[PDB]
Amino acid sequence: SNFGVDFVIHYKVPAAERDEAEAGFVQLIRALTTVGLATEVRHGENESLLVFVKVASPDLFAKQVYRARLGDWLHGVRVAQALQDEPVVEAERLRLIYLMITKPHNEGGAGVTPTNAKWKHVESIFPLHSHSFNKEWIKKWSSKYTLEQTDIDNIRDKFGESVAFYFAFLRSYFRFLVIPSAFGFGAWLLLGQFSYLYALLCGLWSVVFFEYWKKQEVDLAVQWGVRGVSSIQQSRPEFEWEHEVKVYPPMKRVKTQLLQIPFALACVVALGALIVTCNSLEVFINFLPTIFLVIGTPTISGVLMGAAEKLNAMENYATVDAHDAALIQKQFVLNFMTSYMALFFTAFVYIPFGHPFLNFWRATAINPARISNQMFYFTVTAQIVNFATEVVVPYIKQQAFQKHEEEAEFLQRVREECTLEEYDVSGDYREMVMQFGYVAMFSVAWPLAACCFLVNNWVELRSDALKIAISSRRPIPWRTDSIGPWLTALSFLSWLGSITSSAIVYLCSKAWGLLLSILFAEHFYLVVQLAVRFVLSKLDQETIEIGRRMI
């Protein structure tokens, strides 16, 4: 197993800055020595000096643990000799050590942030995996049909909170996806296609699932003693300041943030042109559109994400949560557009009325079922893509790239692990949110399709684990209360689905009827939401003589 190493620092050494590299190495060693953490130095591949750091003095660690617990007590998160009663878990120990490493000098730490400070040579600080535990976990989850709370608790203990919430949310989603599968099978087998009742049941299911997930999330947050952690604020190391606490004028912030609308219009035009020309080519040729979209989506998605990340970096945010919220909002907008605008133009444009490009295409040289059949590919193809780029090809690429002195195996393992990319949990949230959006606003067109989604989830709950198991390094533990801003996205998708399902039902099978159907669907959704929200709250002497003398 591991040699007890608790953290590893890369500290690549450029050739042109040898004196600067030595000075930084000396400064880092001194800073790590003052805080009382034992360190060791070994060899490293590609002009790197891997250094291993672990805690040495138990008294200092216990004092830090007590101080952190008292600080949690002050802020209301939590309501020596107490360590035995409440044992230290690996996640909180790693979090405290990392915070001690990152915290600046003013707060008792030694700030070694790799970007803002003069420490321009360090690039990564990551822990080490437990191969035996990883193998045991993979074997255990591969022989169980359902997952109990013990497995989620073990994941929380060994990895933190964000991973635990992600897995709990995915498990709850898979558990409640069975009902839409049953209703879709029933509707497709008996009712047929474009059933209003199926749309109403889909809306009700979305509402009840969202409310129950909120309740279960609150329950889980209060169970683990983490509820209320989002109340406090964490200072972003990269947050610039211009005057004395650090202050930044809102004028620059709003001026930077108003730049988004140009980019939004530009991406709208860029995606719409491609969508309309693909549709024109398809209606002229009546395999090319599916292949073209499959090839084109990742190339444009990568550049869009890079541009969004750069734009968010240009903006200045005080706390980390605000920056993450902005990034998630931009990511959700871009992904929703690029994953739903094609279906929107195929449904609400092609069907109601069907030339300015058709004539040009002809000079170069209205089947209602188009919504259904295409959707088939638009699920299945996508599914296989989600099982092609995500899992097999990263491992193949890693293997191709891969293809004293008494512990060479450990050094080789560490060197291989260092080059691995850091895991981000936001992508899986995005994928699950888009799955829920598909189910909410488009399952009416193909009631059976929802069933297939269920199967995919039963793989994802394991497959993502494999992604953490091998194809990624151990993420830094963190504390969180909620999944994040994804609740707003889920609510918006549910409302949009309630609007869109009725319109799809009416159009696939004049104007005043459509308006009445939309109004009825929206009001029914609102009433059901109100009723479910109301119901779920209840689940949990002289005086005597004078009185006589009155007569």
User: Could you say which of Ca ion, its own copies, none residue 550 binds, taking C-beta under 5 to 8 angstroms by partner kind?
Assistant: its own copies
Per CB under 8 A, does 25 bind its own copies?
Answer: yes
Task: DSSP letter for 89, please.
Answer: P
Residues facing residue 7 across a β-bridge: 53
Q: Which residues contact 190 (CB under 8 A, 6 or more apart)?
A: none
Q: Is 417 annotated as a binding residue?
A: no
Which strands make up the sheet holding 37-41, listed edge to edge?
37-41, 51-55, 7-9, 125-126
Structure tokens of 162? 């964000």
295 binds its own copies (CB under 8 A): no
Structure tokens at 353: 């009325």
Nearest to 192 by CA among 372, 362, 408: 372
- Residue 538 binds to its own copies (criterion: CB under 8 A): no
Check the annotation: does 217 bind a ligand. no
Query: Exactly one of 18, 215, 252, 255 binds its own copies (CB under 8 A); which one?
Result: 18
What stretches of 107-252 adopt beta strand conformation (E)? 125-126
**At which residue do the structure tokens 């104007």 appear?**
511
Closest distance to its own copies from the beta carbon of 42 (Å):
9
Q: Applying CB under 5 A, does 381 fall inside the site for Ca ion?
A: no
The CA distance from 200 to 408, in Å, is 63
Residue 543 sits in the site that holds its own copies (CB under 8 A): yes
* DSSP string covering 33-71: HHTTEEEEE---TTTB--EEEEE--HHHHHHHHHHHHHH
Is 136 annotated to bind ligand?
Answer: no
136 binds, among its own copies, Ca ion, none (CB under 5 to 8 A by kind): none
Residue 16 sits in the site that holds its own copies (CB under 8 A): no
In this complex, which beta carbon is closest to Ca ion, that of residue 6 or of residue 460?
Answer: 460
* Shortest spacing between CB 546 and its own copies, in angstroms: 5
406 annotated binding-site participant: no
365 is in the binding site of which of Ca ion, its own copies, none (Cβ under 5 to 8 A by kind)?
none
Please check if 386 is assigned to a binding site. yes
Residue 39, binding choice from Ca ion, its own copies, none, Cβ under 5 to 8 Å by partner class: its own copies
| Length of the chain in terms of residues written | 551
Q: Which two tokens stand for residue 320?
A: 């980390």
Angle at 93 between CA 90 and CA 98, to 5 degrees: 125
The binder of its own copies chosen from 4, 29, 218, 352 (CB under 8 A): 29
Q: At what angle do helices 178-186 and 162-176 cross, to 10 degrees?
A: 20
The reply on whether position 544 binds its own copies by CB under 8 A is: yes
Among 6, 161, 315, 428, binds Ca ion (CB under 5 A): 428
Min dist CB 396 to Ca ion, Å, is 17
Q: Which backbone phi and psi does 37 adopt, to 5 degrees?
A: -100, 125
Using rule CB under 5 A, residue 386 touches Ca ion? yes
CB of 138 to Ca ion, least distance (A): 16
Give strand pairing partners of 52.
Answer: 8, 40
Query: What binding mask, one character per residue, do residues 503-532 give for its own copies by CB under 8 A, x or -?
Result: --------xx--xx-xx-------------
Q: How far apart are CA 459 and CA 392, in angstroms?
A: 14
Any known ligand binding at 390? yes
Please report, in range form, the residues annotated as the binding site for Ca(2+).
Answer: 386, 390, 428, 431, 460, 464
Using CB under 5 A as the criterion, which residues of the chain lie in contact with Ca ion when the complex forms? 386, 428, 460, 464
Please report, as ranges, the residues that interact with its own copies according to CB under 8 A.
Answer: 18, 22, 25-26, 29, 39-41, 49, 511-512, 515-516, 518-519, 543-544, 546-548, 550-551
